[PDB]
Amino acid sequence: DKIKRVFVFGDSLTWGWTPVAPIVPTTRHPHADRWTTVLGENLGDGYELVVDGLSGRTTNIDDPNDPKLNGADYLPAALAAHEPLDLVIILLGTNDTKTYLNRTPFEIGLGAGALINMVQKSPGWDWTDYPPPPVLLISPPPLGETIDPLAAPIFVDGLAKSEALPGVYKAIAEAAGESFFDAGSVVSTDGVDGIHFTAETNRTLGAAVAQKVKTLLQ
Amino acid sequence: DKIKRVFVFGDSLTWGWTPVAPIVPTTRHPHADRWTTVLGENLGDGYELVVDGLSGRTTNIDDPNDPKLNGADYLPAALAAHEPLDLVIILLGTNDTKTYLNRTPFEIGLGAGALINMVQKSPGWDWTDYPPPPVLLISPPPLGETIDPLAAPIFVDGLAKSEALPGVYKAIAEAAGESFFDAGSVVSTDGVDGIHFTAETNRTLGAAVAQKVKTLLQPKLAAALEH
Amino acid sequence: DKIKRVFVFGDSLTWGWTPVAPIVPTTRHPHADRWTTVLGENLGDGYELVVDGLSGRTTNIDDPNDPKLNGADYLPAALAAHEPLDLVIILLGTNDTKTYLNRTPFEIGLGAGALINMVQKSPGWDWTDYPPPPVLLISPPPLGETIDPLAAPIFVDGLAKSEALPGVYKAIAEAAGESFFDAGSVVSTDGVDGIHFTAETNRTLGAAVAQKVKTLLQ
Amino acid sequence: QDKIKRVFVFGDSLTWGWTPVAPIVPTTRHPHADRWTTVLGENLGDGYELVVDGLSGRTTNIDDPNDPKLNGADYLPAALAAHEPLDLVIILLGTNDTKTYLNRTPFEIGLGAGALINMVQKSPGWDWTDYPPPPVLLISPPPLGETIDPLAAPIFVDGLAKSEALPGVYKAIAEAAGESFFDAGSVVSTDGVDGIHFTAETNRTLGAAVAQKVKTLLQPKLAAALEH
Amino acid sequence: DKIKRVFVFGDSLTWGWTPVAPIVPTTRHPHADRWTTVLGENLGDGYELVVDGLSGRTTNIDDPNDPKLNGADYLPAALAAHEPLDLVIILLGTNDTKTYLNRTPFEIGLGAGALINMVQKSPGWDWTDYPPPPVLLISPPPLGETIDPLAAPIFVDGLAKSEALPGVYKAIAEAAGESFFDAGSVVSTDGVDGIHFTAETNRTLGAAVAQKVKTLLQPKLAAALEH
Amino acid sequence: DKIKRVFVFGDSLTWGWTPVAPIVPTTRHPHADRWTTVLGENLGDGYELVVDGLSGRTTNIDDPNDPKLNGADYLPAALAAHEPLDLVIILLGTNDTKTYLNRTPFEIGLGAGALINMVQKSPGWDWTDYPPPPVLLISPPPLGETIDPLAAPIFVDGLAKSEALPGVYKAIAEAAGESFFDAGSVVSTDGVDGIHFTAETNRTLGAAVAQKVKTLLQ
Secondary structure (H helix, E strand, O other): OOEEEEEEEOOHHHHHHHOOOOOOOOOOOHHHOOHHHHHHHHHOOOOOEEEOOOOOOOOOOOOOOOOEEEEEHHHHHHHHOOOOOOOOEEOOOHHHHHHOOOOOHHHHHHHHHHHHHHEEEEEEEEOOOOOOOEEEEEEEOOOOOOOOOHHHHOOOOOOHHHHHHHHHHHHHHHOOOEEEEEEOOOOOOOOOOOOOOOOHHHHHHHHHHHHHHHHHOO | OOEEEEEEEOOHHHEEEOOOOOOOOOOEOOOOHHHHHHHHHHHHHEEEEEEEEOOOOOOOEEEOOOOOEEHHHHHHHHHHHHOOOOOOEEEOOHHHOOOHHHOOOHHHHHHHHHHHHHHHHHOOOOEEEOOOOOOHHHHHOOOOOOOOOOOOHHHHHHHHHHHHHHHHHHHHHHOOEEEEEHHHOOOOOOOOOOOOHHHHHHHHHHHHHHHHHHHOOHHHHHHHHHO | OOOEEEEEEHHHHHEOOOOOOOOOOEEOOOHHHHHHHHHHHOOOOOEEEEEOOOOOOOOOOOOOOOOOEHHHHHHHHHHHOOOOEEEEEEOOHHHHOOEEEEEEOHHHHHHHHHHHHHHHHOOOOOOEEEOOOOEEEOOOOOOOOOOOOOHHHHHOHHHHHHHHHHHHHHHHHOOOOOOEEEEEHOOOOOOOOOOOOOOOHHHHHHHHHHHHHHHOOO | OOOOEEEEEOOOOHHHOOOOOOOOOOOOOOHHHHHHHHHHHHHOOOOOOEEEEEEOOOOOEEEEEEEEEEHHHHHHHHHHHHHHHOEEEEEOOHHHHHHHOOOOOOHHHHHHHHHHHHHHOOOOOOOOOOOOOOOOEEEEOOOOOOOOOOOHHHHHHHHHHHHHHHHHHHHHHHOOOOOOEHHHOOOOOOOOOOOOOHHOOOOOOHHOOOOOOOOHHHHHHHHHHHHO | OOOEEEEEEEOOOOOOOOOOOOOOOEEEHHHHHHHHHHHHHHHHOOOOEEEOOOOOOOOOOOOOOOOOEEHHHHHHHHHHHOOOOOEEEEEOOHHHHOHHOOHHHHHHHHHHHHHHHHOOOOOOOOOOOOOOEEEEEOOOOOOOOOOOOHHHHHHOOOOOOHHHHHHHHHHHHOOOOOOOEEHOOOOOOOOOOOOOOOOHHHHHHHHHHHHHHHEEEEHHHHHHHHH | OEEEEEEEEEEEEHHHOOOOOOOOOEEOOOOHHHHHHHHHHHHHHOOOEEEOOOOOEEEEOOOOOOOEHHHHHHHHHHHHHHHOOOOOEEOOOHHHHHHHOOHHHHHHHHHHHHHHHHHHOOOOOEEEOOOOOOOEEEEEOOOOOOOOOHHHHHHHOOHHHHHHHHHHHHHHHHHOOOOEEHHHHHOOOOOOOOOOOOHHHHHHHHHHHHHHHHHHHO
């Protein structure tokens, strides 16, 4: 019985940012406490995860402060490097609400859409011919109402944008003939810095997403 | 009584490519025969059009054969140059089906979406403050089943892509909270070269699109449609 | 008699910036008061205008504050989109005097030259074969002696540069085998903000430029 | 109790697990059990945990005009930050750099590998974390096959000689960076039928050999005691 | 008296391409036979030359075949590296006529203009304050009527373009308030390959350009002589 | 017997920056006092020099303050323009220690390596066929312990980097099969501004480098 391969593509939430005061520097959640790990455990031996979480990462836009943060710069290579996959999970959009990137929620949806499209056109080549995998686009929960004062200037108007993502993400996913899940339906941003997750929140999300995944793959 | 300004942003279909054999060179449809002109006539004195149709133009992707064909390179400037507008009409996607651009229909939808987004964030500045205008995204009709042999190699698998655009364009438009219309619902690509429109097709399209526009910009009529 | 098509390519002066205090925000001159409109009226039914005026637009240089302001990024597409034309009028150079763009008058001439060249090589293709249209390069008048305090820092040394443009523009136009007209010969920058035009100045310019056009086209 | 050591492997199709076949393409991925990185993992034991990033077609630090995703140096900074903290970075690249159309000398390819080592040394570019940067083991690939699949041969003209020259250059560059080196050509050769990729037998040998090398670097107290 | 420094910025004509059959490979003209050398000899001890001639070099446009051939990529650095200078001579434009670069003569003039402007804004900095030097723009002669068959495909329509350069170069130089000289007024492209110069042609050019230079840098004397 | 041609590619040290207080503006060392000139004199009539020294120039990295300062942008053209050569001397690396470029010594070595590689692949063409010339990579001496207060902010941590260059440069040169010389073995940065050389230091360096050159070329 073929082991099913799931690739998880996200930001610091998926890397395992431990929320702290002051907001930085952080250390990585122990493996046991990462949402992806709990996702893996609840799925069982039938499944095998590959995880790529980058602190600061956006859907598809350059961060003028750091040239390595554009998801869409990286994703084509990542997909080809982990082919073949049975599912691609995308949990991005939190960094896209940063003030200086000046994005609307629809713009952020388009960004997630750009990534879905990269998966659908995945590997760009005749060197292999496995099919492209389906995609589960996950909208993150709303930001915290109170963000660490060091980071707050960079998240002005961010909360309202983050609240609007589930609706947009769902339409975009649907338009692509792919799947959707709102992380805000089962958890919220409970980290002390108003942006990242506690281990308790990771656990809830991992277990919830595992149910959703089994529905799609059995 | 304020005159309503409508900006039309498209490709050769909107420039006025006269279909001919061989496919090139062409000459511009006389003004009287252009779809935008008939659109203007059917709208009346209540409306005033601005038209920007570029042969070869795509939604949001570079053509390696010509650096001036990317709609999204041009649109931000165009919008600011014609502010204030009451509506922006986009009729693009036909060139996006060209084989060498290697686009899926969903990708082309995202391209049209990129343009909608540019309109929604239109002018990027404090120099004026008019609101941004609403958008009517128009999907083109399917390509001809028979394309001029000179152009056919460049439109391989293009037909199927063009057939898939209305569904994608509608979702994208809806997702943006904007409007949609399928040109394929009232006309088809009847030009001899299998890509462009006759004057008869222009006339039909112009008249049909004018009805749609009035629905959006005359609120008494907009109201009546919810009934 | 063929109707003659004239394309006007300019900046906020051609859009119809209404001079006000404070300098921004502005509203667009009513159509009846725009210089291009008066140009059209004085030309008669023999002529038909197409107008493209963008606030902030330069000849051929990127504005680091706004990526849509480079005339030469736009002009090739615009020319092809309005083919066939009988004349192209260019009234640009006022924004090129902005301090942070660091341009000399000769440099600005070269920029206008770049645009003339784009018109001369206009459409780059076999898809149509109309000839390319002739060009009337119009130098703007000198800037106001007193510029709105909000904008003044951005126009340091700009006045002297603007005074030098007619001479340079004339040489460049002549070198290209094309025509020239100095807007400063018939009007000056009388707007309250020291940069833009009143409706009275628009009227004078429109009527003067119409005389010049008829000389070129009969 | 002892913290588990994290080793990141950054390579090309050799590291992805290209199964050599005729005709050369299309291929399928070596079963997990037969990948060199997997055997590397098994020979290391529970003391170690691998993260593997192998991309078919990938170069050290140069754009492939045929595919914009193949430049290792475009990807590596992000990858490093995404897998921090690491105890070692292994780089096994250079085989694609010998492709005719990229027009590279062996020294140039060394510089490319050097660019990657430098990215690791300056790894994460930020105050968001402060773990140290990890050491690097640069691995030179073996020489190409003398006979390359006719479909691919035009793109590997003069490639063999370049591949033979890589160990020398890679060693100097690694040494200059104060990092480690290993020549895959010292324990295996390109035995795949297409003249470019590896059989499962060759993967096994390489995995086991590289595991010895890794333990020398990360348990040096033990390595020391063993030598006498 | 300060010794006057003259910087010569050109292409293979200034490097010293020896015309041969077949066209390539060539070897460099002996120093004694280079036009710049004869220029130096005819100027005397009052002057000192610095020479930068690159085979294949254009005014201001990328050659898709070789990324090092754009004069304007190089000139800012070169100017600062040889500061202070009393004159900059530019003899470029021959490679700009190459078919695949698709340039008009006016465009090539603008390219030369771009270089003049770089000289006028020369060093961009506080680190020194010498004045910027004046410029003598030199138009090359027309291409040969017969070009080596290996190179001919790359110089289609090139002859006519090269004939048009003197007029354009003069206007552009004048517009910049700088000087002009037409190499075609005293020599032509007599090399066997139809592109480069013999030693005899170099000698003529060197001596002619030296007269022109002295006019510019000893202008009080030039003035007094004109009677 | 060939007259032997030596091309010297460097920064302000090779241009002839006269150290002064305040640090800027400077004037060029008289020709008689330049290190390259003394190099030429000590070599004799058997040799002929070509010199390209640009104030501010780096090995292979863009200076965000000035787009003309990247050695590797310039070197390919320079090499082809002065072919044929018998030797290329590179004395660069002092500007690479500037704080804002954020380079490690190994990175700077790689930069020098990039230049060596350009020389080894020199002219990229069939238009001539002379061989490529050998290369003598020269590491500069350590910076001054005391730098002009106006320039010091830009050379923080630069001293330590400059001290590390000889070791790195030697490895890189050796790896390329080329030659090396440490300018710090015969001189130090004795200019009043803590960065540039006096005429006395130029003389010492010129004479020392001439010995080295003769060893390589006979």
